[PDB]
Design a protein around this nucleic acid. Structure first.
Lengths: 293, 104, 159, 205
RNA sequence: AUUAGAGGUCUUGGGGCCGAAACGAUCUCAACCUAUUCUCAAACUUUAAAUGGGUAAGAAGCCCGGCUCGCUGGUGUGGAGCCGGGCGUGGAAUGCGAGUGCCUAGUGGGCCACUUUUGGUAAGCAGAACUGGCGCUGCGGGAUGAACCGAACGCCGGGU
RNA sequence: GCUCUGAAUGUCAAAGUGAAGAAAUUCAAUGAAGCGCGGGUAAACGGCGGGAGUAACUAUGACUCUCUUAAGGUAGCCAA
RNA sequence: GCCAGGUGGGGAGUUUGACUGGGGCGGUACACCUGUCAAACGGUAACGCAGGUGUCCUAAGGCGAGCUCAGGGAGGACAGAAACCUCCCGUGGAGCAGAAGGGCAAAAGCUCGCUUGAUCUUGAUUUUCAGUACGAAUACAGACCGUGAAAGCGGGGCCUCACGAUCCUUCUGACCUUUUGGGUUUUAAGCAGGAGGUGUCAGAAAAGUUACCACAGGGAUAACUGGCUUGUGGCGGCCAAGCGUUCAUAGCGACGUCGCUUUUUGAUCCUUCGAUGUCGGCUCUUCCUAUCAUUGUGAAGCAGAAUUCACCAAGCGUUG
RNA sequence: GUCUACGGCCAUACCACCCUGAACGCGCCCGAUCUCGUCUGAUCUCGGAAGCUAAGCAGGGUCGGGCCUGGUUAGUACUUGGAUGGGAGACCGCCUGGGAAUACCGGGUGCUGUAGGCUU
RNA sequence: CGCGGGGUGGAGCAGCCUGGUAGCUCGUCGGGCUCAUAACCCGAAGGUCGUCGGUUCAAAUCCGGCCCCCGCAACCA
RNA sequence: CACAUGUUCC
RNA sequence: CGCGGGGUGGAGCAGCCUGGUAGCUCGUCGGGCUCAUAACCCGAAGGUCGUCGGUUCAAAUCCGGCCCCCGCAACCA
């Protein structure tokens, strides 16, 4: 046979990795470079923009590191958009730009920096940077926290980032990864980025499926027909959605209703039962052994 | 070891990083009218034989390779020395080795 | 004789403990250090840069200079019948906040508390730590039972 | 030949075993540690005798080899060829050094490996014999003939353990009664009450 | 590093055996695997002392109030530095006056002992650790004695 | 080691020669003996091999093979 | 006559390391590095132990991304023990230039892409330490750059080793200072930074011999006794497998083990180098017994003879 | 009661197998026009929502392995200090203090910070 | 360190000069020959002309630098 | 140009 | 004892220094020539580099122990 690999000695020596590494959720090689502060700053917080993409949502949080666990200062989700103006398609590139805008505007409104630091109202898609204003409070600064997502050109972690810098945050970045940076000749094209921010690439997919095949269109964009989103109102939808965020980005928590205090979960067993299950098991073995003999 | 025949480094005269040409440094011909040479010959002239120590216990089987940089800007024209650690074999701009290719 | 290598004889001094190799926890970095903190040194092998020498692994000192990834410590080193207060630069990874001081800082709180409090009461309460005294005279109840008698056992050759 | 055993008698140096550093060590003269009817179960040889040491000295591999034969030979005549089983419970692992002289004197006198020796503590078993209980005096004479092959003094004790087990003879059968000890040939496997339950079903069937 | 049987399977095989021939079968003998079992490690180790090494046990400390900064910044934020004001039951035990600067001789062959300890068969041998001795030192004791035990010395009387 | 030979000659000093240079100076050419090259010489100093195989029984090895150096100790003589 | 080159032990001057169980021979313990010794801080010796070094690297340096290794199992045309392909298991059992130790798994490894932080310049500090250097190293700071979306990271190699003063030479550095009464121009000297090296590695320029020898010394140091030790040599016990036809012990006695002795040689260097006359033989005395003979005896495989073994015993002998 | 995002501590959190998962959520899953990247839309990137808890995941179970924490081993081992103690030595005993580790036998099997849901 | 001359078919060597032409001898191989190894003869296979660069209508050739060897001459860290 | 040798009862 | 070199078809030697990939003479064997043998001619076989384990893409070669053989040295009293 073979020498058993996972033997008793193998477990006696085994050293597990960190919990958030055992699940594939944190890059501690990159987290260490992201969240720690230089020691001559002394609790000067290092804010980072935690942008996370899921299957059906986009989570954009801002946080600074703390020894008891890094603390969320402000958050925003994708599913907060149907409140404002975005019915369906809450995971595309245009959804990310909204959530980054909704995060940025909500934060400065919480720091009283709404009336200053407007940012980029008319969305263009080129390099914008909010320089601080003298006398007035300095601009907020944070860093992107990509995570385990491969940061290729056009990745939606850069889409929400664009929504934030237009909101007024001074996030250091560049235009190498935006959707519209030419790879071969190495220059940016602001017009092409404007398309994806306003969702035009989806319209040119839905307009592509009018002359090609309706069946796949009635299967690819099902909720888009359920909400009547034709390729004609898409740019003016997000453009309206951008205004409806820059005028009231406050969050309103749902009412915490009184719970009925029950249990779906399964409760753990006491020792007295475990020690008596085996006493029933052992008894039921021998009493079934005397029958057949 | 292998160094490229060109390098982009800090130019003292032009004050920033700039491409430099890289060649090896060679001992100039010892002048016959330096101070130490004129002093030495005035000591050897006449009797008494050899008057200064001649080193004989050579122990180091190498040198320190020096590189003579040259700024290739049409107006800079500054050279400066730069040294590397001891090595026996040394060539300028040797063919760049490849990764994972058949050897025979 | 011996060699004067920097790490001569540090086979177990800088080795990571059992089942604790690998990436270091991040609270070892996000722990702050002001000037003049009682700080002790414990060299960590995983971070090669900024390591102290082996003569300070265990020694405790105070901080006098704080840089990005390092602190300067004023530690005492005995060298052949004299002590030297020498300054060393160590990275944060080889550094802990020494708790050999705060239990006195805790004692300062109650000493400042019990001096302001009970002053309006007009009473005088003890403040200094007195060493463990001899215990006072007391009784021992031996209700009902009698003390069991002990006896040295005989010898049984166990091998 | 080799030096007298008076020379390498005390546990003088640190344990210096044959390793990556001490190479070129001759094979130990003792090679066969177990002999007799070693393929015998645990329930026919209940008696076990010991030769426990009483000094902190070094026993050579030749004394271990010599005493083995003399105890083996006497047990052959006494208890047949298969009425016993002998374990030498000391394995020679310490290497002794010889400073062979050819004139150099003591310049650079780190010796060459001479032979192998066995270090033994006080109260430690040297060589033990299991056999039938009625052959009690046969063993206590056999080990007595083995004491003259070793330096210094050592006691001869009859253990209370059943055979070569670590379980006391009085508790042995009652543990085999409630199936606490499963005879594994020359030894016996101790079954606790902690494993998975299905193997408890196995032994009770 | 190392001893011994056990239980496994054809997991490969050594000659085998009715088998042409078959993991079909045969007792096997081997390794291989799984529970056990004997013995070890100055240059192995999960564990892990005793002795030991730092540091702390206040006034240079605490706690208020306010300035300065080109450093640090969402934020008179952060930190550092300044002022000003207020608090002595002196914040473990014991002992003892300390600090400090010049000039400087001799020395730089050492040796012995308890314990730890390397080489050596060992040595009144060679080489180290710690402390005390001898050297530089008499005295009482060990008959005798550089070092052991006691005890260290101005000149005397009494006592012990 | 010693000796003989040579513009048929590679190297080499002072000096002279030529050129450049304001000049010190530099450079180039030429450039003796000696060395290198080539002969002679041991009654010059000195030196003068190794391994296998093989004859009517054995032993032995006249012969043979091989590796080898400038030569491989010949005539003689010997536990002097 | 004066210069130049050759030759020149004919002659002159001088040198011919240190460590060291005496010196020589041999080593390098002489400059460094890892483990151990080393007695749980650090420090710690020996010609103690096991090793290593006088390098190699335009990437084996610098970033970033993507990856997962060793080995094993099961599969798959030729294809097999071993080619390639796929799945599974895989805490490192691989790899990271080298010695060893430490460290390392979305990396410090492997593979790609872009690069020169292996650059320029002040100090402070650490290591050895006298708390001097050199080397090496750590924290910064001021520049100029690389990479990355960015935070960041990088002023060579994941860390512990891979190296060198004054004087001289050489090269680079500046609209540099001096070249002497002033100016110009060469030249030369300065200032700064590299390099040419001292391995006896804090750094002389160095072959022998002395039996023809000299001097200063040394018992710090050998050759002789004497001491301690007894490996070795010699001598003697214990156990008793066997030999002894039979029979362990009349006589022997393997494998082991315990001593003794200083008539062997060693080891050591304590005493003697302002000298203790260093081989034998001859001569002559006394002593020791581990007894060859002789006196008295025990035991034999003692029939007698002869010969063994053991005891009391050194009185008397032990030759040409 | 519980989940997601970001975490702290880094196995009481791991590993093996089995069971059950309301709601939201996380996922799986459907596609490749655009962005981007492969031998291959498997991965990476992107556009979605027909299906599904089968898995991942969560809770639970195992006389479970491991781990954690006690008992025991044991005042044993060893050790500071002391003696004109023992012993031919090797080493041991006592005085004065400190004091371990396997086997073996138990108990335990994640806590928790910030923000946001779900159970309304 | 300075000067000189060497480097080239597989070994050796020519040709470098006063530039467009890379050949000879030995050795491997086919043929013809001889009783025959041979001798002799023919044919084919055999050359980054040590390495780079400059320059030419053309360089193994000319010019600079590097590498190896040989000869002589040099010799203050 | 070179070529050594010999098995014998009848 | 320390140190130095050596071990390669049946025999005697290269190759080793400087890593790939194994030779030289002789001998053996077969066929021919001759009446025959030797010589001679043609053709073949024969070791995988003392042994074992390492370094390296690759080791007769480099490195380590072991085994055999040989040499030098081992001096001053």
């Amino acid at each position: 046979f073979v020498k058993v690999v996972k033997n008793k000695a193998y477990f006696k020596r085994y050293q597990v990795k960190f919990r958030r590494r055992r699940e594939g959720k944190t890059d501690y090689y990159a987290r260490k470079r992201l969240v720690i502060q230089d020691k001559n700053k002394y609790n000067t917080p290092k804010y980072r923009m935690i942008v996370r993409v899921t299957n059906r949502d986009i989570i954009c949080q801002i946080a600074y590191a703390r020894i008891e666990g890094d603390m969320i200062v402000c958050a925003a989700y994708a599913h907060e958009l149907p409140k404002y103006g975005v019915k369906v398609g809450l995971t595309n590139y245009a959804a990310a730009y909204c959530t980054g805008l909704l995060l940025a505007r909500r934060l400065l409104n919480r720091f009283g920096m709404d009336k200053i630091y407007e940012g980029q109202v008319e969305v263009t898609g080129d390099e914008y940077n909010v320089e601080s204003i003298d006398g007035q409070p300095g601009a907020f600064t944070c860093y992107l926290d990509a995570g385990l997502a491969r940061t290729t050109t056009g990745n939606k972690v850069f889409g929400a980032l664009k929504g934030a810098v237009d909101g007024g945050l001074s996030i250091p970045h560049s235009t190498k990864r935006f959707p519209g940076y030419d790879s071969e000749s190495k220059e940016f094209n602001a017009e092409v980025h404007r398309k994806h921010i306003m969702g035009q690439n989806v319209a040119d997919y839905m307009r592509y499926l009018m002359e090609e095949d309706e069946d796949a269109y009635k299967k690819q964009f099902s909720q888009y027909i359920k909400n009547n989103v034709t390729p004609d109102m898409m740019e003016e939808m997000y453009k309206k959605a951008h205004a409806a965020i820059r005028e009231n980005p406050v969050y309103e928590k749902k009412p915490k209703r009184e719970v009925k205090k029950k249990r779906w979960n399964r409760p753990k067993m006491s020792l007295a039962q475990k020690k008596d299950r085996v006493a029933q098991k052992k008894a039921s073995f021998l009493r079934a052994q005397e029958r057949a003999a | 070891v292998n160094v490229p025949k060109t390098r982009r480094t800090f130019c003292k005269k032009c004050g920033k990083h700039q491409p430099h040409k890289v060649t090896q440094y060679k001992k100039g011909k010892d002048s016959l009218y330096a101070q130490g040479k004129r002093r030495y010959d005035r000591k050897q002239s006449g009797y008494g034989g050899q008057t200064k120590p001649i080193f004989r216990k050579k122990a180091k089987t190498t040198k320190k390779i020096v590189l003579r940089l040259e700024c290739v800007e049409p107006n800079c024209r500054s050279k400066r020395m730069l040294a590397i650690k001891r090595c026996k074999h040394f060539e300028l701009g040797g063919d760049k080795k490849r990764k994972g290719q058949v050897i025979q | 004789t011996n060699t004067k290598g920097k790490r001569r004889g540090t086979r177990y001094m800088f080795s990571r403990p059992f089942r604790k190799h690998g990436v270091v926890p991040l609270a070892t970095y996000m722990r702050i250090y002001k000037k003049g903190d009682i700080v002790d040194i414990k060299g960590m092998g995983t971070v090669q840069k900024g390591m102290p020498h082996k003569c300070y692994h265990g020694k405790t000192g105070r901080v006098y200079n704080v840089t990005q990834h390092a602190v300067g410590i004023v530690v005492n080193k005995q060298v052949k019948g004299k002590i030297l207060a020498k300054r060393i630069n160590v990275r944060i990874e080889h550094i802990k906040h020494s708790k050999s001081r705060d239990s006195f800082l805790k004692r300062v709180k109650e000493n400042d508390q019990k001096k302001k409090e009970a002053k309006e009461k007009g009473t005088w309460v003890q403040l200094k730590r007195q060493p463990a005294p001899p215990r006072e005279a007391h009784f021992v109840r031996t209700n009902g039972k009698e003390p069991e008698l002990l006896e040295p056992i005989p010898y049984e050759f166990m091998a | 030949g080799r030096r007298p055993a008076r020379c390498y008698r005390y546990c003088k140096n640190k344990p210096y075993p044959k390793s990556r550093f001490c190479r070129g060590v001759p094979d130990a003269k003792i090679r066969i540690f177990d002999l007799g009817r070693k393929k015998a179960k645990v329930d026919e040889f209940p008696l076990c005798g010991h030769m426990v040491s009483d000094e902190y000295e070094q026993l050579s591999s030749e004394a271990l080899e010599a005493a083995r034969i003399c105890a083996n030979k006497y047990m052959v005549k006494s208890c047949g060829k298969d009425g016993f089983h002998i374990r030498v419970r000391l394995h020679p692992f310490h290497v002794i050094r010889i400073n062979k002289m050819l004139q150099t004197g003591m310049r650079g006198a780190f010796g060459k490996p001479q032979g192998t020796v066995a270090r033994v503590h006080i109260g430690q078993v040297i060589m033990s014999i299991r056999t039938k209980l009625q052959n009690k005096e046969h063993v206590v004479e056999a080990l007595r003939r083995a004491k003259f092959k070793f330096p210094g003094r050592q006691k001869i004790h009859i253990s209370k353990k059943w055979g070569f087990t670590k379980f006391n003879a009085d508790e042995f059968e009652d543990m085999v009664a409630e199936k606490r000890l499963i005879p594994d040939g020359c030894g016996v496997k101790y079954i606790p009450n902690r494993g998975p339950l299905d193997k408890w079903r196995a032994l009770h069937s």
